[PDB]
Design a protein around this ligand. Sequence first.
Ligand SMILES: C[C@@H]1CC[C@@]2(OC1)O[C@H]1[C@@H](O)[C@H]3[C@@H]4CC[C@H]5C[C@@H](O[C@@H]6O[C@H](CO)[C@H](O[C@@H]7O[C@H](CO)[C@@H](O)[C@H](O[C@@H]8OC[C@@H](O)[C@H](O)[C@H]8O)[C@H]7O[C@@H]7O[C@H](CO)[C@H](O)[C@H](O[C@@H]8O[C@H](CO)[C@@H](O)[C@H](O)[C@H]8O)[C@H]7O)[C@H](O)[C@H]6O)[C@H](O)C[C@]5(C)[C@H]4CC[C@]3(C)[C@H]1[C@@H]2C
Ligand SMILES: Nc1ncnc2c1ncn2[C@@H]1O[C@@H]2COP(=O)(O)O[C@H]2[C@H]1O
Ligand SMILES: Nc1ncnc2c1ncn2[C@@H]1O[C@@H]2COP(=O)(O)O[C@H]2[C@H]1O
Lengths: 904, 904
Amino acid sequence: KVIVFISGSCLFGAISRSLFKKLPIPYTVVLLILGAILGVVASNVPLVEEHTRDVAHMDPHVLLQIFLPVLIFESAFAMDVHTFMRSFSQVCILALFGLVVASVLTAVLAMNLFNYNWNFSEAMMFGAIMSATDPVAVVALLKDLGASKQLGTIIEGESLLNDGCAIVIFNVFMKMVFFPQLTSTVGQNVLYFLQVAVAGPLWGYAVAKVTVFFLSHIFNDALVEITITLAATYLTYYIGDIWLEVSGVLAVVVLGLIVNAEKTSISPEVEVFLHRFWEMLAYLANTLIFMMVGVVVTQKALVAVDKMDWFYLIILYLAITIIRGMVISLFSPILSRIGYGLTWRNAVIMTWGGLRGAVGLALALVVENLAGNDVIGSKFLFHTAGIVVLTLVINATTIQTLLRILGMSDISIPKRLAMAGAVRRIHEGQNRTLNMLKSDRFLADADWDIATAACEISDPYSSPREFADMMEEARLRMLKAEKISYWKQFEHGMLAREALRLLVQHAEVAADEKDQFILVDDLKKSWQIKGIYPWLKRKLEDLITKALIPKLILVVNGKINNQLSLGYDVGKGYIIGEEEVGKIIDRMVDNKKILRELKHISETGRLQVVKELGLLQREHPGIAVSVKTRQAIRTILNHSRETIHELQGAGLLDEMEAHKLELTVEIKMKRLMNAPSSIPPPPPENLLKNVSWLAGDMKLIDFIKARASLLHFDYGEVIVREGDESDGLFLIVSGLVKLYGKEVFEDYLTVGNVIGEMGVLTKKPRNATVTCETTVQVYFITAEDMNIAIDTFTLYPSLEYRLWRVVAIRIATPLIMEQMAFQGWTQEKVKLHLERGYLVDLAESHFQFNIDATLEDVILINGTAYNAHTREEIRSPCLISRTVHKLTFQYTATEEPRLFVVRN
Amino acid sequence: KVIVFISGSCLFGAISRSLFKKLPIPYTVVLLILGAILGVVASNVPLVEEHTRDVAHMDPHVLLQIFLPVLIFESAFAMDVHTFMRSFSQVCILALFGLVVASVLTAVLAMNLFNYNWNFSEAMMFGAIMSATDPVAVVALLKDLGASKQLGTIIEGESLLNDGCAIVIFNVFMKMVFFPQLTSTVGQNVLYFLQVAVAGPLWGYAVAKVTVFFLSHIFNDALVEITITLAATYLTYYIGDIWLEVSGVLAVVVLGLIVNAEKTSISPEVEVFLHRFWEMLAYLANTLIFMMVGVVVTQKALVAVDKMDWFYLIILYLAITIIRGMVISLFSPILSRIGYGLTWRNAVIMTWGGLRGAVGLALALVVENLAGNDVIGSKFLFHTAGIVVLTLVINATTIQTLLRILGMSDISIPKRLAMAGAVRRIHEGQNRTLNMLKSDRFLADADWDIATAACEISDPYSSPREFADMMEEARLRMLKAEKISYWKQFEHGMLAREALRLLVQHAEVAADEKDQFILVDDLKKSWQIKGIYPWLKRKLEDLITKALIPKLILVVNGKINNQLSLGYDVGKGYIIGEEEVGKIIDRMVDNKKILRELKHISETGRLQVVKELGLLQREHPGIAVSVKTRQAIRTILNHSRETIHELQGAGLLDEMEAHKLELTVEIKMKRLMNAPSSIPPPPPENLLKNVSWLAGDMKLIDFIKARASLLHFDYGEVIVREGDESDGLFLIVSGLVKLYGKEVFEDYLTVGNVIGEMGVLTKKPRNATVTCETTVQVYFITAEDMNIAIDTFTLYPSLEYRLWRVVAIRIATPLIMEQMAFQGWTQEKVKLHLERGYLVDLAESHFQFNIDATLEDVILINGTAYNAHTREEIRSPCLISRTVHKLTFQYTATEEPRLFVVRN
Ligand SMILES: C[C@@H]1CC[C@@]2(OC1)O[C@H]1[C@@H](O)[C@H]3[C@@H]4CC[C@H]5C[C@@H](O[C@@H]6O[C@H](CO)[C@H](O[C@@H]7O[C@H](CO)[C@@H](O)[C@H](O[C@@H]8OC[C@@H](O)[C@H](O)[C@H]8O)[C@H]7O[C@@H]7O[C@H](CO)[C@H](O)[C@H](O[C@@H]8O[C@H](CO)[C@@H](O)[C@H](O)[C@H]8O)[C@H]7O)[C@H](O)[C@H]6O)[C@H](O)C[C@]5(C)[C@H]4CC[C@]3(C)[C@H]1[C@@H]2C
Ligand SMILES: Nc1ncnc2c1ncn2[C@@H]1O[C@@H]2COP(=O)(O)O[C@H]2[C@H]1O
Ligand SMILES: Nc1ncnc2c1ncn2[C@@H]1O[C@@H]2COP(=O)(O)O[C@H]2[C@H]1O
């Protein structure tokens, strides 16, 4: 029976972990102490052994085959993959250097200390045991303190490589030692080394790729993805183990880091459930193994205790600390030379960053059980248990005190100021809500002292050199204002998460250096296509059965395209940022020279950044249109979600249907996320011109031979000025313009509109000024082209009637929104319901039209009319009231009357 | 080796669920078909048996000990406990009657059909097999259709009791049959029946209570509770099994229904993760066992196949359908008589609601494996496999077609109308957002036809008799009008989930009957304390070591209080509802007599509902104050969460601190759940008068003895009328009043204020009219008591200073909000910063006060003043400008001058 032992183990771990949270020490030593407690009954009363002897002696196979894979997999499952791959090369080379030197320096101290009959193999055993690492406690406490993000992820990163290489070296040397009958030739050894090296990782890569491709074909299902993920993970581990006894751990590590690298094709509930399940398994295993070593070491290491061994325990700690500090200090210059160097504070927290854990204890138990009836294994356990308990119990306190005195974990002034402002905002919000609650007529019998005292909220926190200090304060104000503007810019759905993280990383590293601002060379290389990728691009485009080659090449290009997309929008963000510079920095500033130099560097950055964006869009337009479409879809769907949540909160519908509406918009989200990243070609300009307006006339296709200029106007170029003679005409084909006219009005004209309408109709000069806020492509149309079009209309003036209706809309809408006869009319209503209309020719009516009940809206566009009863001479563009039912018009060649009629 | 079989089972189940989910048939038969597929290779190629013989013959013990508990537990875990206990007695007694009559009517058909050497024991075997039920597919399809919640939950309800009683009867009869050496005396049988009937569930009740009490002591820890809940469930099952081989299933059922009945003391992530985990385990077991039976039945039932057996499988289907329909039809009148009758549509869908599942197949395999080398077990398996495969596949189609033709699952007109209105609201919102986005100067190069084509959204759906029809339409308009008002009224956090569910159930059952409105007798018994509970309350009040008795009695009272709170709460909701009736029903109505009779019946309902609410307040006030405080806490917390979400959306802070803020509001929420349902005593108003206003002066203690009227004024009672002589004075002690005064103003006055100040100070008649909108308790203070107060003022008139400051604020605040010298001043600011003030006696200054820079605010409360330079005769209550620096006052006994001064 083993039920009582494991159940009590779970209960003891639960109570200890829950209780011992106030102190900064990890709870695990309590478990260890509990094991030592069992030691005393492990010497006295037989009832405990007969209930614990079966669990006291697991076969080593179950330990090395079950506990190691799950712990190593969990250590590799909670990673931030993007931050890890930001600096993967540096951390892996530093980790491999550290582990090889820590392994090789153990032999000299082993021979200088013990002077026993211990070969180099025993030294390798000891070095493999002592080099294990555990980052859980330190990363948990630094998240509790919130010092830095890249620090925590690299700290949790290198422990994976340390543990993997340690178990590899241990296991090969262990097969060398305890089974000497095996072949130990150099050729077989290098074959074993290379085999797994090149295979296990690629085997895991292949299985991860095929399982994520299979997972990509699942929509709105709940069970199959978890079932298939668990099955794939186990099958990968089993195949890896049956191939090589060692390679399974590396295979599951690579599988975990790949599957954690994908989040877009899997629903959020799936990975939060998977994270919870795996973390629970790891916690259970950790508690069990720590209590296990605690109970076994007391009964085992009772006879090998010695004072010289205690002195050895004292000196191995100083040895490991000094060698780790020395190696990180001497490879610090190499880290500085590569361009990813860290500060001396980062070095000194690297000095105390080491922490052993469960994996070293596991390897200790398994090497004991392979050792068998010998005092040497008990010696190993005594050393490793002593060193791990002392190193963690003093390491936690030392790092806590070190960050206390050095104070890199202290929060900054801007963030605590913002937190205090938020607290005060919440305070007066609840104050005014309470004041509203006072006036209610149904809650007057309730007291308020307990109500206020139970709902309080508080923050958890609680000379030229003068010119330099004040400009430093000013740059701090500028940087906090810009990053909060960046957050606001991204919260309306207008940016991407990766773009946000890269941009705030750039801002933070720019602000870290003294008197250093945001710079663009980092942005330049962020959008620049460097590395071996252009080399392989040139190779693939030069070399181009056969069917496998081209398809992959396509998505290969897409990868590069994806990169460029990110670059484009991050530059886009900076534009908005510098836009805020133009509208914020003029208020909190107090000095003139500092203000003007900050403005000056602002312009210089702006003019430096506009040009390369212009060239990248001028050579690669499909990327621009694709990311713009992604932008538009993201923002409109985000606002749709916000307004459906508002309508739910408005109480106009129950939440049961809202629970399906959110599913509908969620499947729309995940359809968007798997966007056609393959770049769609921009639509043809002539095709867009044909689509934009109902050009049913074939002479309009013949008008392409009369209207084909493709003229470009750059930023700020005024096209026409008011008062100029109406000679030309323009059709916009690329860009957006702003028109100012005369009260006064401002309009925005996009692609697909005609300009110069009144100058041809009324033969009047220019009256409104148009400006272009970007490079714009336009077609040039002459007055001779207008005459040719008028000839082409012949019996049926299609475009003439269409433009008459259009100009009627542009005249009517301001007076509709201004007059009291139309109040509450929206832009869409006046742009949609007014389209159903036509014109009446006055030649057939002898310039005498009778208004009846069928007519609903009559607007005089041009000409002068007279009332048939009061002889009221009215002129354009006054709106005609419904009182008049008959009008008289004079046939004037200089000003032909124009009227619009709307039927019922 | 068995890895390949189970892995292939997982893959085949996943691919079948992915590929067949479009059709309304369950995927399970597909699995069954795949089992038959294996059958053919199970005859020919030896490579499959050697890969499946180890899994072809599991020991029956592991099946009956593993697969049954997890399946029955999962059937008991996804339940809705409140609707389950709404009609527990009815559903359990009907389930018991149905299962016993299904059992006993199998022997007659067994003897009339087989005519074999089968004892009554074989008949009970068959009846235990065939009576199993499985509601998963039918509840899934009806929840896809969304016909009725109570129907689906009760149909999921009875299957648990059916399966539990079936496995109990099977197991006792199997122990009787295959092990005849056991004792079969009546005494031992009845002892076993008693120890499985009542001794079982109480053990699970005790373990659930102790584990939830243990769980209640942990706040903000997301790991320990999972690893303790799973251990508790496993130990419960193990102890239940070792105590008795049968009762373990009943114990785990009762544990599941208790733990699912608690949600408040456990974080939501815990139960969503636990539901996902357990449901995944049950799905995996179901798939495995169905593939198992599909493989085994082909090789086993190949030799016993016969056509007359096929006729038998035809006739058993008809037998079960006719007996089930007959028994439910003949116990329908008991349901009608008990007050929980169902419609004939409910009866006819109850006829076809039967559906077998995995449990019957499990019992079939285990009875075969106990049978061993015999043809009778293969006979059993052939019958049960054939009947389940025909019944489920044609039952799904028949119920689908039946709901298609009868149309109880057709959605109503109002809800689809509301869905269409919401769709048009979403459409106009996205239209205006698109119009706004068109004007941007950064997205001009983006097309819109794919953009519009990627954001479409649509609904998933697509004479006196005339007087009766139109009043039916009017009452439908009314009922939707109120229920949407009820949803809105809950949405601001002003209700409770249980009260909402009970109220909407009452509204739905009121709307179910034709021309029937909402009633109050149902509401009356909803808040009425009936049953055996008041009888045991009387017994416990009569009867009252010793220490165990009183404490439980206390929480016993608390349970009663809980019920009353809900009653009070639901009553409050109806008041809001009737308020909406006063402001809605007057606009869609078109007829006069229907409108006036609806108003009349509404008012009769109002006058009927106010009186019992008033009494339940008058004998039990502490419940009222407790629920009012709970309401206040709920609404302020909800609005604080909304405004912190808005401030996040305003782009003023990042989400990392928002995580801490939502953690803080969630711990405040669970502290609200920690608020004692035990009723706090109402505060003693005479004792609390010192808290309401400073009563440290002993003359105020004497004034407490001066006036102790405690008079009650009912609803709508005007206390004083304007123009009446100033004879008395009032201090409110319980209630809220509305004061209308003269521009004109409306004020709301609560407990803790003094009225009638101007009638004593200025000796003027009443100018404003006060009304009380409820029953109010007040103290009567005379003008002779005002002369006693004149004696009390003495040298230092502190109470006079306080009331002078109060009336100064009263005069100033509308003047502050109206004058242009104070723009943007809030009520809190003018009520807080103006408190730091005092008065200066003009007698010591000879009625000549000099204004300096120290003074900041000067307001003339009363009297007439004159300027020292311009001789400007100014009078109260005009605000004094800062231009005047000296004033003269005339000593007049009729109107003594009074001014308020504020120091800097
Ligand atoms: C994933 C996470 C991590 C943690 C965890 O999951 C979650 O991991 C899981 C996994 O990792 C599990 C382990 C996997 C490996 C398992 C190996 C298993 O060994 C085998 O277990 C068999 C079970 O039927 C037999 O052994 C019996 O085991 C019972 C349980 O302890 C004893 O109860 C019984 O003995 C009886 O009671 C005790 C004594 O009175 C007598 O021995 C006898 O009356 C034994 O019976 C066996 O048969 C004979 C008697 O009937 C011999 O006595 C023999 O003993 C011999 O000598 C040794 C013992 O002295 C034994 O090792 C050897 O084989 C034998 O020849 C003995 O075993 C068998 O025989 C033995 O091999 C062991 O039981 C449990 C075991 C460790 C598991 C324990 C629980 C775990 C950790 C789980 C744990 C929760
Ligand atoms: N209200 C208006 N809205 C949009 N465009 C206008 C409006 N009024 C005038 N225009 C355009 O501005 C042009 C200015 O010169 P034209 O008169 O040649 O032709 C005019 C029209 O094309
Ligand atoms: N602006 C005000 N706000 C609140 N209460 C007032 C206001 N003006 C007058 N009152 C009260 O209304 C009472 C009406 O009669 P009295 O003049 O006796 O005393 C008066 C005050 O108590």
